[PDB]
Design a protein around this ligand. Structure first.
Ligand SMILES: *[C@@H]1O[C@H](CO[C@H]2O[C@H](C)[C@@H](O)[C@H](O)[C@H]2O)[C@@H](O[C@@H]2O[C@H](CO)[C@@H](O[C@@H]3O[C@H](CO)[C@@H](O)[C@H](O[C@@H]4O[C@H](CO)[C@@H](O)[C@H](O)[C@H]4O[C@@H]4O[C@H](CO)[C@@H](O[C@@H]5O[C@H](CO)[C@@H](O)[C@H](O)[C@H]5O)[C@H](O)[C@H]4O)[C@H]3O)[C@H](O)[C@H]2O)[C@H](O)[C@H]1O
Ligand SMILES: *[C@@H]1O[C@H](CO[C@H]2O[C@H](C)[C@@H](O)[C@H](O)[C@H]2O)[C@@H](O)[C@H](O)[C@H]1O
Ligand SMILES: [Zn+2]
Lengths: 166, 163
């Protein structure tokens, strides 16, 4: 599969993922009190030079984590859990999809000195989100704040998707 | 190749560090001292991306050790110093990660030998001055200005951190 097909398949699932996220809530002003900056790594937003493999490996890791975030207990939200499952199934498919394509591309390359952009700061960034969730005892507001941050993640993954050009 | 992300991370670090250094204001015997900035540092030549990072790496390791010394007499906000050192530290690491990758592709040359020793001795004179001046507020002012000047060269070298 060319990078172009993967990139389109990504833009396409992101959009689907974002759509599902937008079918869970009804704005909560009260929750603005739990507002917290998680500081997505600066390179995810501003780095201008991404090689096809790096952007790909980066989105791969972001997805893996978004999956893990949403795998937590959202019961306190009252969200339609069906939609949550769709969101999860969708991301899971993108992850395994990306995995197979990277496996093919990377097979014969000089290592890849992989996630130079990814690993490092993404792991810590997501740790904050998780720690935040646990600290707030998975409250409905905590989920409202995270959901907004997750949507924000998707906004940047779309930016990253444009470096997947053939 | 990881030099683009490195240089990105380096510009980010250069900005924060300088911003912080400039911020510091406190509550003098001289106000200016010559520490004989190594020709190596004020040397206008084209540093290959690997040497630019080597020099930058050596410069930061030393700058770290300097701001690590006791500055309680300056009245400077320790929180800012804590941040500056944190930043410097985290960046010395990225540089290390990248330099390690082609650690074997570089050879022991006199340019490298003389650059490491001259830099070591320069920061050496700097550390010695703080010590002799018992880490006074007036020695620290002189040192901060020196380090800010160091960063002018760090900016220049960071421009070679690409491709
Ligand atoms: C939370 O969970 C759900 C939210 O997630 C999901 O639904 C969202 C709306 C959607 O955005 C998202 O993609 C999904 O994630 C939410 O909604 C319901 O959940 C499920 C969907 O998975 C649906 O429940 C039933 O599923 C079963 C499948 O085996 C079936 O029992 C049943 O099948 C039919 O399918 C349609 C479409 O889903 C339903 O409208 C009908 O109720 C049902 O049976 C028949 O279907 C047709 C309608 O298509 C009826 O008449 C036709 O209408 C046509 C109109 O153009 C005309 O040609 C003509 O008038 C006639 O042919 C027929 O009379 C009737 O027997 C599903 O009910 C469910 O549909 C979703 O509402 C939950 O509500 C939230 O709590
Ligand atoms: C000493 O330092 C901390 C400052 O921490 C920061 O906040 C200011 C507003 C920013 O410009 C700096 O970049 C950060 O270091 C203060 O909270 C404290 O009040 C001050 O005494
Ligand atoms: Zn880092």
């Amino acid at each position: 599969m060319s990078y172009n097909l993967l990139g389109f398949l990504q833009r396409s699932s992101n959009f689907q993922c974002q759509k599902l996220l937008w079918q869970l809530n009804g704005r909560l002003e009260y929750c603005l009190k739990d507002r917290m900056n998680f500081d997505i790594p600066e390179e995810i937003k501003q780095l201008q030079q991404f090689q096809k493999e790096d952007a790909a490996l980066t989105i791969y890791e972001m997805l893996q984590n978004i999956f893990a975030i949403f795998r937590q207990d959202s019961s306190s939200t009252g969200w339609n859990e069906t939609i949550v499952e769709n969101l999860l199934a969708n991301v899971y498919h993108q992850i395994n999809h990306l995995k197979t394509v990277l496996e093919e591309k990377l097979e014969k390359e000089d290592f890849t000195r992989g996630k130079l952009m990814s690993s490092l700061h993404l792991k810590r960034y997501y740790g904050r989100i998780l720690h935040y969730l646990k600290a707030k005892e998975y409250s409905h507001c905590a989920w409202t704040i995270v959901r907004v941050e997750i949507l924000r993640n998707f906004y940047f993954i779309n930016r990253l998707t444009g470096y997947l050009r053939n």
